[PDB]
From TrEMBL, chain B:
Quaternary organization: Homotrimer. Interacts with the capsid vertex protein; this interaction binds the peripentonal hexons to the neighboring penton base. Interacts with the hexon-linking protein; this interaction tethers the hexons surrounding the penton to those situated in the central plate of the facet. Interacts with the hexon-interlacing protein; this interaction lashes the hexons together. Interacts with host dyneins DYNC1LI1 and DYNC1I2; this interaction might be involved in intracellular microtubule-dependent transport of incoming viral capsid.
Family: Belongs to the adenoviridae hexon protein family.
Induction description: Expressed in the late phase of the viral replicative cycle.
Descriptive protein name: Hexon protein
Subcellular compartments: Host nucleus; Virion
Further information: All late proteins expressed from the major late promoter are produced by alternative splicing and alternative polyadenylation of the same gene giving rise to non-overlapping ORFs. A leader sequence is present in the N-terminus of all these mRNAs and is recognized by the viral shutoff protein to provide expression although conventional translation via ribosome scanning from the cap has been shut off in the host cell.
Region of the whole protein represented: 50 to 98 of 925
Protein task: Major capsid protein that self-associates to form 240 hexon trimers, each in the shape of a hexagon, building most of the pseudo T=25 capsid. Assembled into trimeric units with the help of the chaperone shutoff protein. Transported by pre-protein VI to the nucleus where it associates with other structural proteins to form an empty capsid. Might be involved, through its interaction with host dyneins, in the intracellular microtubule-dependent transport of incoming viral capsid to the nucleus.
Domain of life: Viruses
Automatic annotation (TrEMBL), chain C:
The protein's role, per its UniProt record: Major capsid protein that self-associates to form 240 hexon trimers, each in the shape of a hexagon, building most of the pseudo T=25 capsid. Assembled into trimeric units with the help of the chaperone shutoff protein. Transported by pre-protein VI to the nucleus where it associates with other structural proteins to form an empty capsid. Might be involved, through its interaction with host dyneins, in the intracellular microtubule-dependent transport of incoming viral capsid to the nucleus.
Miscellaneous comment in the UniProt entry for this protein: All late proteins expressed from the major late promoter are produced by alternative splicing and alternative polyadenylation of the same gene giving rise to non-overlapping ORFs. A leader sequence is present in the N-terminus of all these mRNAs and is recognized by the viral shutoff protein to provide expression although conventional translation via ribosome scanning from the cap has been shut off in the host cell.
Gene expressing this chain: Hexon
Name this protein carries in UniProt: Hexon protein
Top-level taxon of origin: Viruses
Organism expressing this protein natively: Human adenovirus F serotype 41 (HAdV-41)
Whole-protein coverage range: 294 to 341 of 925
Automatic annotation (TrEMBL), chain D:
Function: Hexon-linking protein-N: Structural component of the virion that acts as a cement protein on the capsid interior and which glue the peripentonal hexons and group-of-nine hexons together.
Induction description: Expressed in the late phase of the viral replicative cycle.
Protein name per the record: Pre-hexon-linking protein VIII
Classification via Gene3D superfamilies: 6.10.250.1460
Length: 49, 49, 48, 180
């Protein structure tokens, strides 16, 4: 139970029957994904330094 | 058990949301902005978040 | 013996595309309300 | 086995809104295989209640119809949306306002106005011009299509079976529109 690859992820999509996206009904700042690691640029969604 | 009512909003709400400054003052020592934080009649805050 | 340089015509792109640049996860634009500032233009990666 | 069946649960179609063909419930079964007589007569006494709750729920809630999983729902058996008629407040009735400009006064800005005393406001219908058919929503599939408890299963003539339990079957073609 001692993991060390926790930081190597990006967008995590969960979609039931491939058409209702699950964060809920557009509940987040991108309606179809869970953004682990926005690496590049763009908005400043990057928190926690 | 979880409280099955009174947690879920079937209307497409939003968990988190950034706001945009409607002014700026580029003083050589100061920097002043004012915002327009506002809700859609059913979104209480704590304002510490 | 001379010979003329080959010409080009440096104009803009056809139909000005690529000036606004679309379809980038990050560096995308918004069209939001003033009272809520929720985005109505999210730009997916695989859509030219 | 035949007597206390594990019920056929449906699957929701988000695109078409129809029923996506049901399946045997294979994700709530107890593992009663490691149990002697005083519990395997209790476990079968539990499933015999959820096969009776699902029959006293199917009568209270579902619409009585012949073709379960129909391909085209009627207009009246689908939840419509009829909000209030939108009361529109007209600002300035122009029947006496165009006379004010032709007198010479240019207007700007904007009772409601001082030069005219009256202010009419109209209402109009906010529903659709025709009600909706062909496909039920998610909350209708929450309401209808309770898990169909199928007793003495697959025990008859061909065509007398529930052919819509096959999750490939066109309801008005007697056939899978397959790869063609």
């Amino acid at each position: 139970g001692t993991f060390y690859l926790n930081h190597t992820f990006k967008k995590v999509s969960i979609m039931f029957d491939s058409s209702v996206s699950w964060p809920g009904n557009d509940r987040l700042l991108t309606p179809n994904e869970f953004e682990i690691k926005r690496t590049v640029d763009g908005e400043g969604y990057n928190v926690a330094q | 058990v979880a409280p099955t009512h009174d947690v879920t909003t079937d209307r497409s709400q939003r968990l988190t949301l950034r706001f945009v400054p409607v002014d700026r003052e580029d003083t050589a020592y100061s920097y002043k902005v004012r915002f327009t934080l506002a809700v859609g009649d059913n979104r209480v805050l704590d304002m510490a978040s | 013996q001379a010979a003329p340089n080959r010409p080009n015509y440096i104009g803009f792109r056809d139909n000005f595309i690529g000036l606004m640049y679309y379809n980038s996860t990050g560096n995308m634009g918004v069209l939001a309300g003033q009272a809520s500032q929720l985005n109505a233009v999210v730009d997916l990666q695989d859509r030219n | 086995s035949k007597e206390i069946p594990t019920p056929y649960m449906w699957s929701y179609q988000p695109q078409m809104g129809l029923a996506a063909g049901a399946s045997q419930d294979y994700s709530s079964r107890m593992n009663w295989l490691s149990a002697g007589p005083h519990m395997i007569g209790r476990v079968n006494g539990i499933r015999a209640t959820r096969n009776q709750i699902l029959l006293e729920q199917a009568a209270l809630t579902s619409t009585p119809r012949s073709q379960l999983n129909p391909p085209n729902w009627p207009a009246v058996q689908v939840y419509q949306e009829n909000p209030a008629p939108t009361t529109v407040l007209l600002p300035r009735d122009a029947e006496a306002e165009v006379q004010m400009t032709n007198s010479g006064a240019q207007l700007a800005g904007g009772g409601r106005s001082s030069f005219t005393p009256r202010q009419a406001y109209l209402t109009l219908q906010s529903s659709s011009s025709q009600p909706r058919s062909g496909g039920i929503g998610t909350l209708q599939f929450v309401e209808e299509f309770v898990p169909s408890v199928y007793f003495n299963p697959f025990s008859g003539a061909p065509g007398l079976y529930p052919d819509d339990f096959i999750p490939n079957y066109d309801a008005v073609s007697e056939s899978v529109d397959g790869y063609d």
